[PDB]
Design a binder for these strands. Structure first.
Lengths: 192, 130, 162, 76, 256
RNA sequence: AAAUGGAUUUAAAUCUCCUUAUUUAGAGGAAGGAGAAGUCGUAACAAGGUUUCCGUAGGUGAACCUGCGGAAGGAUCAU
RNA sequence: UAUCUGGUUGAUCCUGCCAGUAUUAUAUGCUGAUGUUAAAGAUUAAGCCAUGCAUGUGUAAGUAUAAAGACCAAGUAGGAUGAAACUGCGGACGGCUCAUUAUAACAGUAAUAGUUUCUUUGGUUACAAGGAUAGCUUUGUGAAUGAUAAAGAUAAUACUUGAGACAAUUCAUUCAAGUGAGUUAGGAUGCCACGACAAUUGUAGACAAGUAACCAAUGAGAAUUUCUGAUCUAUCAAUCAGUUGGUAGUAUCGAGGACUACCAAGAUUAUAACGGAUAACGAGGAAUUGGGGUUCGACAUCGGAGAGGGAGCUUUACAGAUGGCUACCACUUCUAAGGAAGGCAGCAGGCGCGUAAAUUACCCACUUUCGAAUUGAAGAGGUAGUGACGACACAUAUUGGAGGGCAAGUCUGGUGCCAGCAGCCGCGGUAAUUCCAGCUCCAAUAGUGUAUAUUAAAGUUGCUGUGAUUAAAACGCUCGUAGUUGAAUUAAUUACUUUGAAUAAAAUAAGGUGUUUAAAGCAAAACAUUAUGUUAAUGAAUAUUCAAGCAUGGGACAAUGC
RNA sequence: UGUAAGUUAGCAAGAAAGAGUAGCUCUGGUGAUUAUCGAAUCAGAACUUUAAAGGUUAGGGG
């Protein structure tokens, strides 16, 4: 099968490399699994030394961390909008590390309502700051100091926030990501 | 080049001045494997195919007694002494014999014109004790 | 190599096979000590040449070198006990002055001839080969047995061998 | 190359039979971080060994000293 | 070489075992455990050769499987158990206690002990790392993992172990005024006092050690094993006391 | 969860072109060596009977001859 | 032993080769009293294989109503012991061969802060549940394989569930101490997946025994990787397009163009790249050497690779396994003609091939490996058989030669430039010192001739160390890059040099020791009339050792200084 | 992609020889004006089928 040895390559001088042995299991490679988007489907791979790798063939949900608010919420994945390596990965909705995806910010908005008493999905969000169990007014003044990037708010109101997958679904069998923020969101939004 | 850092010319000279050695070259390049009726082997084996007799050079007179042999390993046809005395009557023909060579000379030794091989066996117990 | 044991040579043949100068000197030692062939002289020459090489190697070093002192004294001590080198000469340069006669005069066949146990040097070989001669506690049937100084006065006939 | 240079080392090989040395050379592909901006061809460079960073790049530039110029300033 | 090797040819065995080169084609490969392959003495070697208690491997099995041999405080039934450094060895049926120790001739020498000093052992710390839960532990040259130690117990120190309880009794710092027995290269078994410790930033630490007779030599920090403090040992040295007769005194004493 | 259908991965095997290397057949042509005291000459060694030789060009049964320019290893160390 | 001699001439002095000489190792002719030790189908064919064996394993301990327990023995949950079977472990070690392989592998060195099992060793974290399966019984098929189909039951330390209460994984954020050096071992917060310490065994040999994960050791191990080091060849001068680098990913135990997408045009080379040859596995080492060297190393030990040829995979901690499987090519065998398995480069043995290489033996008693374990297996290993490959000691007879080299007959009979001898010069044409024989003696001697090849001789390959006017050989001449070599001079590295560190043995040298001596072996004693003691007896310091790498003192001679 | 002998060194040469090509849905490269506007041309990827220059035009080669 696929091999990862360097005996089949050429030297840095361009000279061909001759053969002394045959293929061996130490340099064994495995067929890639392109984790698409859909119904959950994972497989167990017996790796070397008996350890087990979780090969995620298809996934739909994932846990995403909001860095600023210090929470992590499970969420359904909607679409893959930008893959920095191959444009084919955008159409096929292949889940890989560093793939900018879109998820519905329902639990994050719900968490924000309970934790804060306001709703990001409100188009009058900044106006609702000026206009006011009853101790939520103490928390109310945190936003008159800290602000969100505009592109995040548009995703909240449109129901599609941008997140970056930060795990290896073909190795760990799961999608772990994080919501993009100030400097990263501007860069990745101009790409789209 | 007699210097403490000139070890490349003094090594690439006795590497290209060593091919003009007649006995070193002749035993390095490939003729001992195509142009040798014997090969590496000290002795060979073949079927006598013709009793012959070769004249002598010309400080000398007489007729040498020798054979003609087709060897097994190669398939070549050679000529060879029937050593000392009255031995062409011990070989018959189409017998499997043992060839040894002669030694050396200018290049050819024993039966004077162009013979370099000596029979040592007749499939018997040698053309000495027969 | 193919075997895990060790096998060593003990003699070397001369370079020039035919010399009349060498043939008479060999015969002088053959008759004088009643030796079987010329191999026995060659063994003595090889044995002597080994010691000569060792002394010659140390003689090129410094006089007080630790390597010379250890190996020089070891060579002399073995030579004194073998009886080849008399005890008065305690310097390495006396090893180089040794000859094949010094070593040959220490074979058992020579000593038992000098001790008077046999009439002739050839009688000693037959006496030794017949298990008739005991050295201290221990019978010997090899005439090439080189006797040490301390074992020299322990040579006597056998006492009713079976 | 981008963020990569080629370092040549000149040394002497001792041939025992002739009791003389011969000049030899070897080329090492090393990684040059953008911290060294004034690094050009012909400069003296100290390199250290790290993990394999490419098929051939297994070293890294630690310091460099500018040297004489040859009208061709080929900076990194 | 598809997997681990289970045999060990006689000529490949470590030299300080002195297995006769014509006795057999194989040597006893020591099973893994506390000590490495080349700094250990298999239990079969000790009984058959060093003590003559057995004449072949068959008889060593009978002795060891009879539950008659104790290594440290525990009792082992493995014929090829790796017995290395100061680890004590007790045969109670014969009422004797030894201690596998190095001598000046780069060899493992059985130092006899009384029953009182056979109840403790000297272990060399190898590392000190914070485990999970901020629980520090030390690893000794023996391979023992020891839980919360004294905070002063650093990497290159020496500890005194109570074999009946496993507790730390006494510890010796690795300073420049303490005795040490080399366990490594050319200085195996040599005993001296540390006098200088020069450290090179990149590769290695080399230590200068002065013998009890004024002799001096150098070794890597890997081979230094602190025995005691201020020229006073916590264990009994072998007969030569870790002092090398340079080249002649050994020779003449052997001639005599 | 077994037969089974499909699409990749790694691909044996086989066929067709083309290349390289080695060995080997061939009418005929031009060579070299050895032998047989074969036929024709006398080229060289003496000033070898036209001093010999080198490069080049031409010619001739064959050695070789002739033209141009060199050399002495010349048969002149000399007017 | 730091050695030469015969041959160009009427004679002389040279160059120069041919021949002689000695030694290794392969074959072979003749011959052969012993003891010790010892190689032995590598060379040509990694060609083909009949037959026999080479991997199995049971303790008190996982499971045993065998209709097994007259065999100790008795027996109401199964008495000791227990065949077969399930389960566990092993066959990834060992054994053979050298085809492939030219910076590939291998050796020394260094890294893994870039990975990591298995075994072993230290630790850390319900008064008991659920099905069905073999040996067993019963019915059978096929010519047949280590072929197999139905039904009926029955166990678990097999397969599951389940209380007994954390651990390690991914991701995001954050506080940070050893180390030369780490947002590092570690702690905290939030989140997902995973989730226990047998629902276990000895009534006898309370104490064992067993188990799941997680740390550390074994592990200077395995695997990758760093620096230096390989034979010949220029009638091989240019080579390379995943090729060189970057970013993101993918795959893997993991770094990495290892693979993919995009981007750039790079990488090697006269200091020999890329090609070609090897009758090339690499090293420790072996033969021969005054010094320098030359040649060899399939094969004791270490590393690599392979099982007729490729390829693809299963199990598992470790295999791209072949005394495992699948497919294609070339073979081989049984057959009831329907079909079936097999891979001796394992130990014996056969065919073929060649100049060229041994018994179809016995045993696990030594060394040691595996296993459920003090016991069972082991063509590993040991013993025996053939054995003039070799080495040592030792009786009293063969081999080659008698012109010179080269020690030895101008003895006698035949032979008549014929037969023939002759490594070389040469002798033989009837008076042979050389042919063929008889006698004699020359050399070695249980060995001695021949042939091929290595080494010395060879100062006929030259560094030590050659020759160039006429013997062979100074470019027609000048310019010219790399290369090599470079005047005197001064009160940070490299190179050189001196000590070490660390580094497998075997081998070489060398220290001790009466294997009868010797080659060997690393043991036996010298006496203590010896248990007693020296004695906790020896292990040669055993030194090497070049080319690289590390540390140290010196800076004369050199290079880069800058 | 690949291409020989021969040669007047210009050629032979479209040598010879092999592979690809359809439909549909997309992706990317090549500019102007200062976000808007515009050109046919090239490269690549999934999917589908009756597997694609051939309706017409259109070299047989050595």
């Amino acid at each position: 099968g696929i091999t990862r040895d360097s005996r089949h390559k050429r030297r840095a001088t361009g000279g061909k490399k001759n053969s002394m042995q045959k293929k061996k299991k130490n340099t064994m490679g495995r067929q890639p699994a392109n984790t698409r988007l859909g119904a959950i489907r994972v497989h167990d791979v017996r790796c070397r030394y008996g350890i087990i790798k979780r090969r995620a063939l298809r996934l739909e949900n994932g846990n995403f961390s909001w860095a600023s608010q210090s929470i992590t919420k499970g969420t359904k994945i909607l679409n893959v909008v930008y893959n920095a390596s191959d444009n084919d990965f955008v159409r096929t909705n292949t889940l890989v590390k560093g793939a900018i995806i879109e998820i519905d910010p329902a639990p994050f908005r719900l968490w924000f309502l309970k934790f804060y008493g306001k709703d990001i999905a409100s188009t009058d969000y900044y106006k609702s700051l000026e206009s006011a169990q009853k101790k939520y007014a103490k928390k109310l003044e945190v936003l008159k100091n800290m602000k969100f990037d505009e592109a995040l708010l548009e995703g909240f109101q449109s129901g599609r926030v941008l997140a970056c997958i930060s795990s290896r679904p073909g190795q760990t069998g799961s999608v772990e990501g994080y919501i993009l923020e100030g400097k990263e969101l501007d860069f990745y939004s101009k790409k789209i | 080049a007699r210097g403490l850092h000139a070890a490349r010319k003094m090594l690439a000279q006795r590497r290209a001045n060593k091919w003009a050695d007649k006995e070193w070259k002749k035993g390095k390049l490939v003729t001992r494997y195509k142009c040798n009726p014997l090969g590496t082997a000290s002795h060979a084996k073949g079927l006598v195919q013709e009793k012959l007799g070769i004249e002598t050079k010309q400080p000398n007179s007489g007729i040498r007694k020798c054979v003609r042999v087709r060897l097994l390993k190669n398939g070549k046809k050679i000529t060879a002494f029937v050593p000392r005395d009255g031995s062409l009557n011990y070989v018959n023909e189409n017998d499997e014999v043992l060839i040894s060579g002669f030694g050396r000379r200018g290049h050819a030794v024993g039966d004077i014109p162009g013979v370099r091989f000596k029979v040592v066996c007749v499939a018997g117990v040698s053309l000495w004790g027969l | 190599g193919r075997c895990l044991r060790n096998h060593s040579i003990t003699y070397k043949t001369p370079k020039v096979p035919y010399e009349r100068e060498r043939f008479d000197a060999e015969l002088k030692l053959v008759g004088q000590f009643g030796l079987k062939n010329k191999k026995e002289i060659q063994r003595v020459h090889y044995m002597l040449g080994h010691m000569r090489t060792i002394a010659k190697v140390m003689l090129m070093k410094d006089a007080k070198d630790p390597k010379r002192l250890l190996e020089g004294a070891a060579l002399l001590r073995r030579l004194h006990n073998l009886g080849i080198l008399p005890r008065d000469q305690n310097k390495l340069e006396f090893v180089l002055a040794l000859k094949e006669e010094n070593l040959l005069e220490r074979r058992l066949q020579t000593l038992v001839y000098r001790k008077g146990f046999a009439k002739s040097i050839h009688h000693a070989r037959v006496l030794i080969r017949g298990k008739m001669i005991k050295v201290g506690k221990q019978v010997v049937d090899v005439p090439s047995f080189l006797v040490r100084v301390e074992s020299e006065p322990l040579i006597q006939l056998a006492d009713n061998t079976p | 190359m981008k963020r990569t240079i080629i370092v040549r080392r000149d040394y002497f090989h001792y041939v025992s039979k002739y009791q003389r040395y011969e000049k030899r050379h070897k080329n090492i592909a090393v990684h040059c971080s953008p911290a060294f901006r004034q690094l050009k061809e012909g400069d003296h460079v100290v390199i250290g060994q790290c993990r394999p960073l490419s098929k051939t790049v297994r070293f890294n530039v630690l310091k460099f000293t500018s040297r004489g110029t040859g009208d061709k300033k080929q900076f990194a | 070489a598809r997997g681990p090797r289970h045999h060990l040819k006689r000529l490949n065995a470590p030299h300080h075992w002195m297995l006769s080169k014509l006795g057999g084609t194989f040597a006893p490969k020591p099973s893994h455990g506390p000590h490495g392959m080349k700094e250990c003495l298999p239990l079969i070697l000790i009984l058959r050769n060093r003590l003559n208690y057995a004449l072949n491997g068959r008889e060593v099995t009978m002795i060891v499987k009879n539950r008659t041999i104790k290594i440290d405080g525990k009792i082992r039934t493995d014929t090829r158990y790796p017995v290395g450094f100061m680890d004590v060895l007790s045969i109670p049926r014969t009422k004797e206690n030894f201690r596998l120790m190095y001598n000046t001739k780069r060899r493992f020498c059985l130092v006899p002990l009384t029953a009182e000093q056979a109840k403790f052992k000297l272990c060399k710390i190898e590392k000190r790392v914070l485990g999970t839960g901020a629980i520090p532990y030390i690893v000794t040259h023996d391979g023992r993992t020891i839980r919360y130690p004294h905070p002063e117990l650093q990497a290159n120190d020496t500890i005194k172990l109570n074999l009946e309880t496993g507790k730390i009794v006494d510890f010796v710092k690795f300073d420049i005024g303490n005795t040490a027995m080399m366990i490594g290269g050319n200085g195996m078994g040599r005993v001296g006092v540390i006098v200088k410790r020069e450290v090179h930033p990149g590769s290695f630490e080399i230590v200068h050690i002065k013998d009890a007779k004024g002799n001096t030599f150098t070794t890597r920090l890997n081979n230094v094993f602190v025995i005691g403090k201020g020229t006073e040992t916590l264990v009994n040295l072998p007969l030569d006391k870790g002092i090398k007769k340079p080249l002649l005194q050994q020779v003449n004493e052997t001639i005599k």
